[PDB]
């Protein structure tokens, strides 16, 4: 199918408690493969997937250098943003950045991304054309003017259309055992009486990869979107994901409800019912 590569970065200041903490992680699809934490004993970028371990020492050296450089620029940016927003130096503030690329089945670029947030709010984002910016407020418009004068988008476009895609393709091949394997969900329906007049039906999906999935309850064939309780998809800790969806049904009407599961690992979407 299609695939993605993303690098995530967070810097958090902590006045009176040293310099900002910086954490960055890299993902291919829903698989973590590298990490760097400025508070680690001897901070280096470290592998987190078996298929990246074969990269040589100069790969690791370069990556580590980049991570440390980004940590330093983020420290400078946190000080700048205090000025842009007329903020005190007393508080903790957060800078987040994500960038990366999506490719289709043939490996061609579908689109690239580079976007930032300050204190949890959109700040500036590269537009899909990879040539212009969307700034969220007048503070971000100052960064926009700076990055336009510096021709930042031209450099990012080159990376996103080139290296990003090329290296994603390399990782997909080196990790094809796992990155190109979809694990379908193991599914079942449980039944829990609430009272003499009502019962909970819960539809489970376990052990699936990648994380994208659709679980829906139907009553007499109609989607129960507003009466379905749907938890966030959650990691099992072993590469796979879990999810459930629950409805409250009048006692005796359980057979009018069906749970529908769509996942890229399934050849056909599944229909399940409670089996007493």
């Amino acid at each position: 199918g299609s695939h993605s590569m993303r690098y995530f970065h967070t810097s958090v200041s902590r006045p009176g408690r040293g310099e900002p903490r910086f954490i960055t992680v890299g993902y291919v699809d829903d698989t973590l493969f590298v990490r760097f934490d400025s508070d680690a004993a001897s901070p280096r970028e470290e592998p987190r997937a078996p298929w990246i371990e074969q990269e040589g020492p100069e790969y690791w050296d370069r990556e580590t250098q980049i991570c440390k450089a980004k940590a330093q620029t983020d420290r400078e940016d946190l000080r700048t943003l205090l000025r842009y927003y007329n903020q005190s130096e007393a508080g903790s503030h957060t800078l987040q950045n994500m960038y990366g690329c999506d490719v289709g089945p043939d490996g061609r670029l579908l689109r690239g991304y580079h976007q930032d947030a300050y204190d949890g709010k959109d700040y500036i984002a590269l537009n899909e054309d990879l040539s212009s910016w969307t700034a969220a407020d007048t503070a971000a418009q100052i960064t926009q003017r700076k990055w336009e004068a510096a021709r930042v988008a031209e450099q990012l476009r080159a990376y996103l259309e080139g290296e990003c895609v090329e290296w994603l393709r390399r990782y997909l091949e080196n990790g094809k055992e796992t990155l190109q394997r979809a694990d379908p969900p193991k599914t079942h329906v449980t039944h829990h009486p609430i009272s003499d007049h009502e019962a909970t039906l819960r539809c489970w999906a376990l052990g699936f990869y990648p994380a994208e999935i659709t679980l829906t309850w139907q009553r007499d064939g109609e989607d129960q979107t507003q009466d379905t309780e749907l938890v966030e998809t959650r990691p099992a800790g072993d590469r796979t994901f879990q999810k459930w969806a629950a409805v409250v049904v009048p006692s005796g009407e359980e057979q009018r409800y069906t749970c529908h599961v769509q996942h890229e690992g399934l050849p056909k979407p599944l229909t399940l019912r409670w089996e007493p």
Binding site: I66, E76, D77, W147, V152
Partner: peptide
């Protein structure tokens, strides 16, 4: 493989 500009300060 990560990107690094060859200034990107905000």
């Amino acid at each position: 493989k990560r990107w690094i500009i060859l200034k990107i300060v905000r």
